[PDB]
Amino acid sequence: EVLPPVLTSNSEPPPVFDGTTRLYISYTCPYAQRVWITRNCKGLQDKIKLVPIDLQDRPAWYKEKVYPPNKVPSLEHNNEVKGESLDLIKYIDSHFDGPSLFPDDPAKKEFAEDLFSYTGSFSKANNSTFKGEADEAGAAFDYIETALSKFDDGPFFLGQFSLVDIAYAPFIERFQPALLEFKKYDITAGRPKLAAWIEEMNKVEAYNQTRHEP
Numbered sequence: 001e002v003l004p005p006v007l008t009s010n011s012e013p014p015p016v017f018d019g020t021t022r023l024y025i026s027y028t029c030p031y032a033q034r035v036w037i038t039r040n041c042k043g044l045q046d047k048i049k050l051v052p053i054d055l056q057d058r059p060a061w062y063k064e065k066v067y068p069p070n071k072v073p074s075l076e077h078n079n080e081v082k083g084e085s086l087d088l089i090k091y092i093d094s095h096f097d098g099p100s101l102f103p104d105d106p107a108k109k110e111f112a113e114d115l116f117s118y119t120g121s122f123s124k125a126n127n128s129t130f131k132g133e134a135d136e137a138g139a140a141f142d143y144i145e146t147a148l149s150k151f152d153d154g155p156f157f158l159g160q161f162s163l164v165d166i167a168y169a170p171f172i173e174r175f176q177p178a179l180l181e182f183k184k185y186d187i188t189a190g191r192p193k194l195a196a197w198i199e200e201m202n203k204v205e206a207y208n209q210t211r212h213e214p
């Protein structure tokens with residue numbers, strides 16, 4: 001796959017609502033990365049076109065013609081532009097071909113909703129730590145470690161790979177090296193299920209490719 005160029009304030013607008021599916025992203029936004037990973041994991045590279053924008057020098061046509069809330073990601077599909085990364089990974093999973101990324105088992109679904117609900121707290125805990133407000137990252141990763149012990153039919157949050165792993169991957173990807181650098185803190189220390197989860201995620205090529213750049 002060829003990753004397309006970043007569009008700036010000086011870029012001409014793409015067709016909007018011409019029938020092509022477009023995923024508007026920033027190459028470094030973790031929320032957008034969630035959706036990009038979902039696209040790749042479902043083999044949708046030829047179905048969903050990436051439209052990367054520069055958030056520091058962004059095209060006015062984005063807010064004006066594509067997505068008024070003026071954030072990434074947003075998904076243009078079937079004459080609607082929709083936002084919210086968690087909504088979007090669920091939407092793509094259920095409206096496009098490719099392997100299903102969400103289990104049918106009601107108990108796994110229920111646990112998944114607990115974990116989706118926890119994403120805000122997870123980010124807040126880590127950010128609190130980086131900002132020196134409270135050392136909450138350890139407790140947050142303890143929660144993750146415990147969650148990984150719930151289902152023993154695979155190494156991922158719901159046992160087998162799912163949208164839940166995808167939701168967390170961009171954030172763990174960023175928090176891990178930052179905690180090591182800024183707080184001299186290794187999240188894998190004492191957290192074997194988490195260490196295994198990171199190793200297994202890193203074997204997923206569809207995810208690794210979202211760490212790529214033009």
Ligand SMILES: N[C@@H](CCC(=O)N[C@@H](CS)C(=O)NCC(=O)O)C(=O)O
Nearest residue numbers: 029030031070071072073084085086
């Ligand atoms: N709740 C949104 C968050 C999206 C978001 O905060 N994106 C940021 C980049 S990390 C953004 O587009 N910032 C640009 C701005 O606020 O103007 C989601 O889950 O998709």
